[PDB]
Symmetry: C2
Subunit: 226 residues, 2 copies
């Protein structure tokens, strides 16, 4: 339903960009048009994640965020379809494709959740998704795509942090090297604290700073494990 | 080598976080953290290299992945040398687009492990040799904006080649004889578009053929 009307819109915009790129132009102008059409096709590839997101086993908080993401994508595409400035279409499609990448991450979270057996890690997932919902609400009220970009970027990096939280628990559940276990526990304790700070931060740029600190910490452990 | 790349990434991120802390304007802060995050994304892409270097992986994939890591190392050394924040942001961004190829090379590896349609392999080697030409020309480019263009075509090419594979899965495992025959017809047009890409002189023309082929594959994917 919603997919086949978002794909119709994506289809229309892609062919208009292909036609404009197939007409006369310099290389840099054709390539920038084609970068927009490519990002639009990536968008459609992200839409294919919804069937798995919208399936019955998926966590309902994930489903509601993905629906907010699709509405925002719809809004920016409509804005792109009536914009005429090429830099405006490029910026609007770019932010729509960042939003679309959240669907990939939401789908990755869905898969990682149905495999994880730790109930506390499930609960930490829910306070993160509640922060993402806050970020998405602010994006839904912004008129400036650059303001949307910022809030979505924090949401992307937050989702990646949740991914590294599942991964580090998996390492902790399975690593037999006792020093890997020692460092995993140390990193998880630090990341939990950094996530609580980001959840109390209010300022999106402070959220992003804490999240990046947590990701750098988790990455030190992931590189140590392999 | 991976341990030395991570050390450089770690160094660049901490410098960027320190600047983000020392910056006062919220727009510059966010731009600096975007660069730091992109560096972390790049370390995560490095973690895909051990599966890529496994004995089962296509050696064409392995050779390409080592060209990508060479490009990335060069950009990180340049980012560590530059002083301009804007220049560091462009260099890091292109390194991170390069890093994404490692994700796409990993995924290609996985799909190639379940490749019941053998004809793909000769076709995929032609794509990979097209991607090698792009990556070889990227290594000789120097201009980070020209590396970005060559890398962008390689990314979409790899995405097309990945999509070329899941069409074969839809072909062999579809019930509807029309949907299963469209998959086989789409795959033939994609071969002709790839053939046109292999003889094209400029990356802009390659990209246009690859987007035409992706559009064709995507239309099939949305049909089922």
């Amino acid at each position: 339903p919603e997919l086949d009307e978002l794909w119709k819109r994506v289809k229309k915009l892609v062919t208009e960009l292909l036609e404009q790129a197939e007409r006369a132009g310099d290389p840099e102008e054709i390539f920038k048009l084609l970068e927009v059409a490519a990002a639009l096709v990536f968008l459609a590839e992200m839409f294919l994640r919804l069937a798995a997101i919208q399936e019955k086993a998926t966590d309902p908080e994930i489903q509601e965020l993905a629906e907010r993401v699709l509405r925002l994508i719809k809004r920016l595409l409509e804005e792109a379809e009536r914009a005429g400035d090429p830099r405006r279409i490029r910026e609007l499609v770019e932010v729509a494709s960042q939003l679309a990448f959240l669907l990939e991450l939401f789908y990755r979270l869905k898969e990682i959740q149905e495999r994880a057996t730790d109930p506390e890690i499930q609960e930490l997932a829910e306070r993160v998704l509640r922060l993402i919902k806050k970020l998405l609400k602010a994006a839904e009220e912004a008129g400036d795509p650059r303001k949307i970009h910022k809030l979505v970027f924090v949401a992307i990096v937050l989702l990646f942090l949740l991914q590294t939280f599942y991964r580090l628990k998996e390492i902790q559940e399975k690593a037999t090297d006792p020093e890997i276990q020692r460092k995993a526990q140390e990193v998880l304790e630090k990341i939990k604290r950094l996530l609580e700070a980001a959840e109390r931060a209010g300022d999106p740029a402070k959220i992003l700073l804490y999240v990046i600190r947590a990701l750098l910490l988790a990455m030190e452990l992931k590189f140590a494990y392999r």
